[PDB]
Design a protein around this ligand. Structure first.
Ligand SMILES: Nc1ncnc2c1ncn2[C@@H]1O[C@H](COP(=O)(O)O)[C@@H](O)[C@H]1O
Ligand SMILES: Nc1ncnc2c1ncn2[C@@H]1O[C@H](COP(=O)(O)O)[C@@H](O)[C@H]1O
Lengths: 562, 562
RNA sequence: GCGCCGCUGGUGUAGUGGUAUCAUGCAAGAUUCCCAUUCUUGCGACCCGGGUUCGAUUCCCGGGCGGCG
RNA sequence: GCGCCGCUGGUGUAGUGGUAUCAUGCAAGAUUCCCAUUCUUGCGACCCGGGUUCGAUUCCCGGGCGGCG
């Protein structure tokens, strides 16, 4: 129901984006974003920062894309995403472990290569030249957040919960990329890691989103061949469809964000993972695609890296009431025991630790009646002191649960394309994008009605004033009609237009016309006040309905050349 | 004169940045930026966008980091930055071409490897798995701008001048990185390509910067063992020290930018290239380091890529007055001539093109007296028509000159560190950063004077109000003294502080105290007005002197617990 | 790459062939009520691999990382 | 990877063993004076490598890129 072909022509022609290295014939899965697309991506990301990082006071960090092999071996990406296959003399690549299992001889480490005589989706490289340290381009931005967990917890003064975020590119050496921007080899990701006490799974700010009505696609609905269904968010948590208000909160603000940047609510749903994690999916001409992933990496990455580095990655919680504990434990001279016995005493300490307090005090009872006991599979003298004592714990070690919202900016952008792309009534040559003002490429088009020179002082002052207000704009003063210019600026989604006519130059206070992209409807206002108005529009402070409600609507020019 | 050690301790401790993959032992030349550093980098970049991209209406684009081999072969990076050497059985890597030239046999393509039996600084990888398409991580961000030149010129309606920019990471497989952030393997660059008619080398906006007084380090000053010297910018262009006002303009706004983000003017100079291009250099504890590069890639990249792709990369200018030209040229039947002769006729057209009009009309004069002539090193019949005619040119092809300002954000940031780092008088434990407000990590610290609970409603409303104003802040409500909190927030360069005391809770309208980081001086204002004030501070709309000039200064608390 | 010495809580340090001192920091409770206050209590560390040894943080070798060329 | 047909100005097309049609777009000058107006003039293209041929954009082979599995 979206003319994907027509839309793609507009995206290509106006250079929203294009095939990377196109003049060299191009490369699959690689794309350059041109002025308008890059402006859009930067607005989407800017909006994202104010949404998530600013509102939740999230700790943003910036790690390298370059990653050494061990890190991704520990995280399981090396085995999961990689192996090595065999190729036919003249094309026809086949899996190795596969064809080994299939059995025969050949065709149709290198120890295995020698064995036969009887491929990684991660981009691989080498750090330092000479290449003694192999590495990869990171396939996600999360690992950099896990590696810095101690530093990040310390910045938050050791307290939970907290969240870290990363906004940056990731790489995926894809087999055969199709689907335009949807399955690409390099893409910009926005990843949040929200660390929480597993016991404090309640969000204080959930009441902010409980009233939203969302399309939820439960696992039960999926198994039972049902369709997704609209629910009040609060109801969904209350009835247990969404497990808790931490998950719920995160869902609500994701929804608010996707809709804020122009994704249609009716072509947006949240799909539950089945045999807690919900994914944001949008409906496109390619069908339902995942735009926001969700993972729960509790007992996974922190643990792996902890085990691999021997660096304890854990939070630490104070106990309201300190627990005291009786401790009956053996206190063996390491020197004495190790000197008297040789491989013996390794096994003898392999043993003494594994003993009940009963056994222990029987042992020392045997030892105060001078002065030595003996044991299973060794005769111990006083190379063994014994010890009992009170031991108070003021703090318990908390292994944080992690929630991982993973945003694919490319898919989000493409989704915005399909959902905001339109053609006009009549002149179908005239296509436009309904980008919401907070993210449109430019806020304002600045245009004179005719090529007449009496216009240009007004255009310049106006352009200068807009730049002064930090309002991205674009002046279109070219040699054609108002209508050709309005077509060109609408085509790239410029949200508003300011036309400077004869009434601007001739009339007693200077007023120009402000035009809405979607409606083409206009109002008229003092040329010195319009920057602020466009500014309120771009900041989402006011609506177009709000503008029509405050200013005189356009009922024609009163003047002409004079 | 800067305690680099003390400063580095503060940068490490508060996690401005840290060694990448530190828990895995770390990797040289790779760094992660923590919350404060990442906040700073994002502000520097945001400021940069409003400076250059917005003010000059520059075309920002976003290309991939992944780059295929041919592109960098054509640009000369493959031969310049790469080769292949030989290694000793137990360490001791030596150049190849080198040791071949040195002569002997061995030690102390693969055709060469076989020959001996008698290293790239670019990060190398393979696109697609199976690896039939070798590539690199881009070492700069410029190539993506050159490859899209047609698309970018078209977006600017074929007209010159224009400028494209890119903000993104680049990679450099460095031999031995030292010098902290200064010589790293991955770094974020901000690159501008300004395309200009070589004949229109005058900037209309130069008068905006002509009054700046800058330290200029001319080539003549360098050769003649002189020091850099302060000059009025306009004077420098007028006296020919700086060739033109395009270069001059760009220098002035670079200066304004570097100073805007906190680089001391007195430890900032512009160094001319010697046997036009000036580089911005800042004075640090490592001495004078280059922070902004400048290149002139006129007749270089566009040409190379043009030659390699056979795609003409050129601007096109209309001629005020169309030139008419007489054209006397041979018009040879390709078929006739090629059928009658076999390798002969290649050489015969190798020839006919190379002939003067005199010779031509002598030839046709020989041919109208029926009906065939003959030539050096072949007898031509009517397989040769001849032709004269008027040929008007309405447009001349312009090969754009390019100016390339290349900003090293890491070096810029580090420079800001050394230039804004300070220790206080007395308590030297108390170090702070004089980040200018427009770029400080947070604008505002929100703090209560004591742990008393009557404070927390005020802190929350205030925090919420700040977020509503889009003001990055950080609430510090921890268990120590006002002074320990003010130390912690000063240490990371929080520009302002808002303390909520007993006078805030007890007194008839609610006012709190606003504190300047540098001076520690304070004023007192209504808690509902402070977000806007901090906002004006952060946007550079007002100074601290401006604040003291408007509000009551802090002369003590009037109330206490009650 | 080569050479020069190092690597102990988050930061800086003591010391050791038998798991470790002091300071700061942070956390908690008191105290204080405008500039790292004071007291009590608590958390947290021997860079990694191999070797010799009964056992290495300590001795040796090799990596990694840093400083000085 | 395999298979299925393609690739001609920025966009879309005509056609061809001897360098190419029309439209749009953009540029310029007129015209118009609020929604791709009209007229004139101008700019801009055969995806890349190899083969056969005197010569390939055209035929064949192989890449690259796209569509359909
Ligand atoms: N190959 C790709 N191209 C573009 N976007 C992707 C790609 N792979 C993943 N994504 C996006 O990144 C998110 C996280 O995916 P993953 O990390 O694979 O679970 C997804 O929800 C997508 O939006
Ligand atoms: N290895 C590096 N590490 C950090 N910054 C760099 C590095 N190389 C270059 N730069 C920065 O990038 C700018 C351009 O350098 P170049 O492209 O090498 O001329 C310089 O002025 C530096 O600020």
């Amino acid at each position: 129901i979206v003319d994907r072909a027509k839309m793609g022509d507009t995206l290509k022609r106006r250079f929203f984006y294009d095939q990377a290295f196109a003049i060299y014939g191009g490369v699959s899965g690689l794309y350059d974003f041109g002025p308008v697309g890059c402006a859009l991506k930067n607005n989407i990301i800017q909006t994202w920062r104010q949404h998530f990082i600013q509102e939740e006071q999230i700790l943003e960090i910036d790690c390298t894309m370059l990653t050494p092999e061990p890190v991704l071996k520990t995280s399981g990406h090396v085995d999961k995403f990689a192996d090595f296959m065999v190729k036919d003399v003249k094309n026809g690549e086949r899996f190795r472990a596969d064809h080994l299992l299939k059995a025969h001889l050949q065709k149709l480490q290198q120890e295995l290569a020698d064995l036969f005589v009887n491929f990684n989706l991660m981009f691989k490289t080498f750090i330092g030249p000479g290449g003694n340290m192999p590495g990869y381009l990171r396939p996600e931005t999360a690992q950099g957040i896990f590696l810095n967990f101690k530093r990040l917890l310390e910045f938050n003064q050791g307290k939970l919960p907290f969240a870290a975020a990363q906004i940056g590119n990731s790489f995926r050496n894809e087999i055969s990329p199709r689907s335009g921007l949807i399955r690409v080899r390099e893409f910009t990701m926005a990843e949040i890691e929200h660390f929480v006490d597993p016991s404090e799974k309640d969000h204080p700010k959930f009441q902010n989103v409980a009233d939203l009505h969302l399309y939820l696609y439960s696992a039960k609905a999926q198994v039972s061949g049902q369709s997704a269904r609209k629910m009040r968010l609060g109801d969904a948590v209350e009835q247990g469809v969404i497990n808790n208000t931490v998950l719920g909160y995160f869902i609500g603000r994701i929804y608010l964000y996707l809709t804020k940047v122009g994704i249609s609510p009716d072509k947006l749903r949240f799909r539950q993972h089945m045999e807690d994690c919900w994914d944001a999916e949008s409906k496109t001409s390619y069908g339902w695609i995942e735009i926001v992933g969700c993972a729960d990496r509790s007992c996974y990455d922190l643990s792996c890296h902890a085990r691999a580095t021997k660096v304890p990655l854990v939070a630490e919680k104070p106990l309201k009431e300190p627990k005291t504990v009786n401790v009956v434990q053996f206190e063996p001279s390491k020197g004495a025991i190790g000197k008297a016995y040789k491989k013996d005493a390794k096994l003898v300490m392999e043993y003494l630790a594994i003993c009940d307090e009963c056994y222990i005090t029987e042992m020392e009872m045997l030892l105060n009646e001078k002065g030595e006991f003996t044991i299973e599979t060794q005769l111990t003298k006083d190379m063994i002191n014994v010890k009992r004592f009170q031991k108070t714990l003021y703090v318990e070690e908390v292994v944080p649960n992690v929630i991982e919202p993973s945003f694919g900016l490319g898919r989000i952008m493409y989704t915005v394309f399909e959902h905001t792309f339109h053609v006009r009534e009549g002149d179908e040559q005239r296509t436009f994008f309904s980008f919401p003002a907070v993210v449109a490429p430019f806020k304002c088009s600045v245009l004179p009605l005719s090529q007449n020179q009496e216009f240009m002082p007004f255009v310049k002052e106006l352009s200068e004033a807009l730049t002064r207000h930090g309002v991205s704009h674009k002046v279109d003063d070219s040699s054609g009609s108002i209508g050709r210019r309005y077509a060109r600026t609408d085509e790239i989604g410029v949200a508003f237009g300011v036309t400077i006519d004869f009434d601007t130059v001739n009339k007693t206070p200077h007023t120009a016309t402000l035009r809405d992209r979607d409606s083409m409807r206009q109002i008229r206002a003092e040329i010195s006040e319009l920057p602020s108005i466009v500014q309120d529009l771009a900041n989402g402070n006011i609506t177009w309905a709000d503008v029509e409600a405050r200013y005189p609507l356009f009922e024609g020019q009163e003047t002409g050349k004079k």
